[PDB]
């Protein structure tokens, strides 16, 4: 509603500049009162104190209005950006986990900055620019139509139309270079900061000088492609000065081809010299801010190309939520592959019922991350189907399923905050109390009670600041804090030791009173006392049943678990 | 380098400017005698030609010079920002542990593209608008201090006195601001990327809305501290106008005064304005030099402030390197804690005997990654030292001691990278043979082999593209590649299954022969066939034997191996 006014207002300030533009020409007057009637007289005096006036005020007044444009646009500006900014992000964290995954943390930086900073440039450029510049154009094409004639200004456009299509040529002649040294820096950028990433590696192998150089090496191929393209623009801009010098010398020349006074011989000359110097300050902005826009429209379709192209799973038209009546998982002939080119789950079917405690068991590399994975819908399956409760995971709502779902993930990261923070995010404003509840239920409320700031203490980036098993107990007081109906446990007590893992064994199993629990381990020990033990092989269902059943069976489990009676 | 002949030709270029500046002046001469001599009919047609052509030929003359000065200092602009990046990069990398486990890489990147777009513009404006405003003003001073008296050009240098004082009054009003908004959109940046790195847990807890409102609360505080700071700049630069204008005004009032012609000369009025236009347009330049270069010095200040923070583990004057004969090692009361506020290790003493295989176990949180990181020397201790083959590790160099040490960590990072790349990392320059023999050591082999891109398949950021055992076993391939005289693994086998635990365990059994092995385990069962183990307990050694033998004394050790046994 305001910000419509604000805009009214900056184009009022441009209609100021007009006025100063107009101003210009009134100096004209000045010189029309200098020959005619000149020395010896009055207006000998005149010609001083009014020029003053026009100038000293004039130019005052003109940049006075050009920076209050500023001050009355820029809570125009900067919220546009901040719109893009949170809009950017919510569309950040819409994005699909192979994305994610595979993201270079450095170039989509650089995507993701350059694309704010060029929309934030060229909005400003759209709105003072475009329609100041045609406003004083235009006033250039009437007012020497009606003060000069019609050859010069077809002259004049006509040399403009060439300025344009050599600007057009050049900068499509420029785009491969500029484009060239835009993917460099990215990929230099996304190197040091994958470096930065694998700080402690490169401490563990000596690898500092190795970094050192293959960052060098990104380094000085954008610095020779940054050469190129600022050659260019040199080149350009060159191309243009030429085009409006000529320009000039032909405005210059042509007045004073009819006589030696012409029809007006003071004035003339001033007109054309003033309208030539504010003349050359359109084309400059103008070449300049048509290439700027070009760039900006190139890196929002870069920036765009990166945020819009990433839609693998969505919700069906109008798609229901989830009822967990009974929390019930069905594996329907799942077929998945994370790549095209590599085919992982080769229909996996089962049931894991309602009300019981699952465990998922088999070699490294067998896929059950892969089954967690699919069952929170990160993906979606190439056949079969996956059921809670017989609803269809690909026909509701993402939200309300992974409401419906916790899991203390393998690989957990954390905020870098404190540890209440992480605690109490599992519920959106969760109390104290539940906080309490769960870092109780996790064997680490003894510790965070000893801790001098206890809740407050800093975890660092990822939480790397606490120790491994205090970091898993922190996953699970989340999950505790997030209480849903359907518990997930991927590889949960393999840093800690067997006593802590004894306490959170004996949690697990007192909040799975009406509620299912699967835990995918390789410590077969922790899982001894499941309901059904689901052993998977190369994407396949090998065995199934209770722990003294495949033990007996004398298949993959019982070696498996023989294997840790070994020591 | 040669560098430096490209800077002279630079300035060269710009005195080649300075030749323009005085064309300018220099043609309004030949038209200053078209008033009262110069009527043979000829010189009246001379004069308007010769100064359309010198015109002309001026100001395209001006921009190509200009022009020119970019294209011969590109090169030697780029080169400086490559040099001045790979430098911080390079400090980047030696700043110890610490600072990299509690940065916030959003703000931290903030700082360094300030520092560098600084720098970038810095260097072009202090050598080409510095230096060239100087060599005018001196020649103007020097010109005409002979043809004007002692009023105007001390009231001139008087105003630029007050220009100054307004300026540095402004500026230092606007510091704090600037450095408001600076922190504000850092403080931005590093939520945005902090929520960006838990994209996963952001999933689990269905948090999208909760960090999109944090990042719009962020935005929206960076927006306003940015208005405030661009109203500041405008209200600089309308006040910067303003004494400008003014002096233009006092200027063109005082030399207009004596005669309606000319005050002192024939040409003081128009050899006055065309100085006084070519001077305010560098010196409309020199109102933003200042600033430019004094925030950019600023700025650098600041980045190279953080980065010179005194590190926390240096090298001694004139340190020797690590001589390993025998490779054993021996904590000597070592007192250590990360925090001041937190003591972890209280004299802590023990002898890993040089070729043995040596375990830690104890409870989580007790403080054994913490042996880990000092043996690194990641941390200086607070008391006691560390020996390997009893020579000091405090008084010998970072690099030796940590190419006698290889780790396999229990938070392991790979690089976004193919699977060889971080397996080859281990050794500089490893050959294809060693690293086949480590991908065979670390049963990764097979898996790799039955891989469609083989050596060539993507792990993605962090490794995250790979299973948690398979990223255990190429950590464990790169430490194989490696081969330092000390092996160290913090829980290697907790994300394998029991069957390719024990596949690595031979492995590890297979090396080490006469090599020291220390094994940080939780899982027993893994490391009850060592030569010692040494059970910590709340930062102190508990008891330290054989397993047959700390099972007997039923300590510690029996009770948590006693702990398996539960059923
Ligand atoms: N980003 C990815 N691209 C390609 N394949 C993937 C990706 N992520 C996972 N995989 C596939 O998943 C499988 C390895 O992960 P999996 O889901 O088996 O973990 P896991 O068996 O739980 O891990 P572990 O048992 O080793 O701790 C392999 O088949 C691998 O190809
Ligand atoms: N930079 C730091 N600032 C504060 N505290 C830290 C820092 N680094 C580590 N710590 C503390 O050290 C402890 C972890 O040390 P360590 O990882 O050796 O435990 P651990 O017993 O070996 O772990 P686990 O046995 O659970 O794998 C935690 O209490 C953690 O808070």
């Given at each position: 509603?305001?910000?419509?006014?604000?805009?009214?207002?900056?184009?009022?300030?441009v209609?100021?500049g007009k006025?100063?533009t107009?101003?210009?020409?009134?100096?004209?007057?000045?010189?029309?009162?200098?020959?005619?009637?000149?020395?010896?007289?009055?207006?000998?005096?005149?010609?001083?104190?009014?020029?003053?006036?026009?100038?000293?005020?004039?130019?005052?007044?003109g940049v006075?209005?050009d920076?209050?444009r500023?001050?009355?646009?820029?809570?125009?500006?900067?919220?546009?950006?901040?719109?893009?900014?949170?809009?950017?992000?919510?569309?950040?964290?819409?994005?699909?986990?192979?994305?994610?995954?595979?993201?270079?943390?450095?170039?989509?930086?650089?995507?993701?900055?350059?694309?704010?900073?060029?929309?934030?440039t060229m909005?400003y450029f759209l709105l003072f620019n475009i329609a100041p510049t045609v406003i004083e154009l235009?006033?250039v094409?009437?007012?020497?139509?009606?003060?000069?004639?019609?050859?010069?200004?077809?002259?004049?456009?006509?040399?403009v139309?060439?300025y344009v299509?050599?600007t057009?040529?050049?900068?499509?002649?420029?785009?491969?270079?500029?484009?060239?040294?835009?993917?460099?820096?990215?990929?230099?950028?996304?190197?040091?900061?994958?470096?930065?990433?694998?700080?402690?590696?490169?401490?563990?192998?000596?690898?500092?000088?190795?970094?050192?150089?293959?960052?060098?090496?990104?380094?000085?191929?954008?610095?020779?492609?940054?050469?190129?393209?600022?050659?260019?623009?040199?080149?350009l801009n060159?191309?243009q000065a030429?085009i409006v010098?000529?320009?000039?010398?032909?405005?210059?020349?042509?007045?004073?081809?009819?006589?030696?006074?012409?029809?007006?011989?003071?004035?003339?000359?001033?007109?054309?010299?003033?309208?030539?110097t504010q003349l050359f300050r359109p084309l400059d902005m103008l070449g300049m801010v048509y290439r700027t826009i070009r760039?900006?429209?190139?890196?929002?379709?870069?920036?765009?190309?990166?945020?819009?192209?990433?839609?693998?799973?969505?919700?069906?038209?109008?798609?229901?939520?989830?009822?967990?009546?009974?929390?019930?998982?069905?594996?329907?002939?799942?077929?998945?592959?994370?790549?095209?080119?590599?085919?992982?789950?080769?229909?996996?079917?089962?049931?894991?019922?309602?009300?019981?405690?699952?465990?998922?068991?088999?070699?490294?590399?067998?896929?059950?991350?892969?089954?967690?994975?699919?069952?929170?819908?990160?993906?979606?399956?190439?056949?079969?189907?996956?059921?809670?409760?017989?609803?269809?995971?690909?026909?509701?709502?993402?939200?309300?399923?992974?409401?419906?779902?916790?899991?203390?993930?393998?690989?957990?990261?954390?905020?870098?905050?404190?540890?209440?923070?992480?605690?109490?995010?599992?519920?959106?404003?969760?109390?104290?109390?539940?906080?309490?509840?769960?870092?109780?239920?996790?064997?680490?409320?003894?510790?965070?009670?000893?801790?001098?700031?206890?809740?407050?203490?800093?975890?660092?980036?990822?939480?790397?600041?606490?120790?491994?098993?205090?970091?898993?107990?922190?996953?699970?007081?989340?999950?505790?804090?997030?209480?849903?109906?359907?518990?997930?446990?991927?590889?949960?007590?393999?840093?800690?030791?067997?006593?802590?893992?004894?306490?959170?064994?004996?949690?697990?199993?007192?909040?799975?009173?009406?509620?299912?629990?699967?835990?995918?381990?390789?410590?077969?020990?922790?899982?001894?006392?499941?309901?059904?033990?689901?052993?998977?092989?190369?994407?396949?269902?090998?065995?199934?049943?209770?722990?003294?059943?495949?033990?007996?069976?004398?298949?993959?489990?019982?070696?498996?678990?023989?294997?840790?009676?070994?020591?």
């Open positions: 509603a305001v910000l419509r006014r604000r805009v009214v207002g900056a184009i009022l300030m209609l100021l006025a100063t107009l101003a210009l020409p009134f100096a004209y007057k000045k010189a029309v009162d200098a020959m005619t009637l000149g020395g010896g007289a009055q207006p000998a005096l005149t010609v001083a104190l009014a020029f003053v006036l026009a100038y000293a005020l004039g130019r005052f007044s006075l209005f920076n209050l500023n001050i009355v646009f820029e809570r125009v500006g900067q919220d546009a950006t901040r719109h893009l900014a949170e809009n950017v992000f919510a569309r950040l964290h819409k994005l699909s986990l192979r994305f994610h995954l595979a993201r270079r943390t450095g170039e989509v930086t650089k995507v993701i900055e350059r694309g704010t900073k060029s929309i934030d909005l235009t006033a094409i009437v007012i020497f139509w009606l003060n000069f004639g019609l050859g010069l200004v077809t002259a004049t456009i006509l040399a139309i060439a299509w050599t057009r040529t050049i900068t499509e002649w420029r785009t491969h270079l500029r484009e060239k040294m835009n993917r460099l820096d990215g990929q230099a950028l996304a190197r040091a900061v994958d470096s930065l990433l694998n700080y402690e590696t490169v401490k563990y192998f000596g690898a500092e000088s190795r970094e050192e150089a293959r960052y060098a090496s990104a380094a000085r191929a954008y610095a020779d492609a940054a050469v190129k393209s600022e050659n260019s623009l040199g080149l060159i191309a030429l010098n000529l320009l000039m010398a032909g405005a210059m020349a042509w007045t004073v081809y009819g006589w030696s006074q012409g029809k007006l011989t003071v004035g003339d000359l001033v007109f054309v010299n003033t309208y030539l760039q900006g429209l190139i890196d929002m379709a870069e920036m765009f190309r990166l945020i819009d192209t990433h839609i693998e799973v969505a919700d069906v038209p109008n798609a229901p939520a989830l009822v967990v009546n009974r929390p019930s998982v069905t594996f329907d002939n799942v077929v998945f592959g994370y790549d095209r080119d590599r085919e992982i789950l080769h229909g996996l079917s089962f049931e894991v019922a309602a009300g019981s405690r699952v465990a998922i068991v088999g070699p490294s590399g067998a896929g059950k991350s892969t089954i967690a994975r699919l069952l929170f819908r990160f993906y979606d399956p190439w056949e079969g189907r996956i059921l809670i409760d017989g609803q269809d995971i690909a026909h509701v709502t993402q939200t309300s399923l992974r409401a419906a779902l916790g899991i203390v993930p393998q690989d957990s990261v954390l905020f870098n905050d404190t540890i209440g923070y992480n605690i109490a995010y599992g519920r959106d404003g969760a109390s104290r109390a539940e906080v309490d509840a769960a870092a109780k239920g996790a064997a680490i409320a003894d510790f965070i009670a000893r801790l001098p700031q206890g809740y407050d203490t800093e975890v660092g980036e990822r939480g790397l600041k606490l120790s491994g098993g205090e970091k898993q107990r922190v996953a699970i007081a989340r999950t505790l804090v997030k209480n849903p109906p359907i518990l997930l446990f991927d590889q949960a007590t393999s840093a800690l030791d067997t006593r802590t893992e004894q306490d959170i064994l004996s949690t697990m199993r007192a909040v799975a009173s009406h509620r299912t629990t699967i835990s995918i381990a390789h410590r077969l020990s922790t899982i001894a006392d499941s309901d059904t033990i689901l052993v998977l092989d190369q994407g396949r269902l090998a065995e199934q049943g209770s722990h003294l059943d495949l033990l007996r069976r004398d298949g993959l489990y019982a070696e498996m678990w023989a294997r840790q009676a070994a020591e």
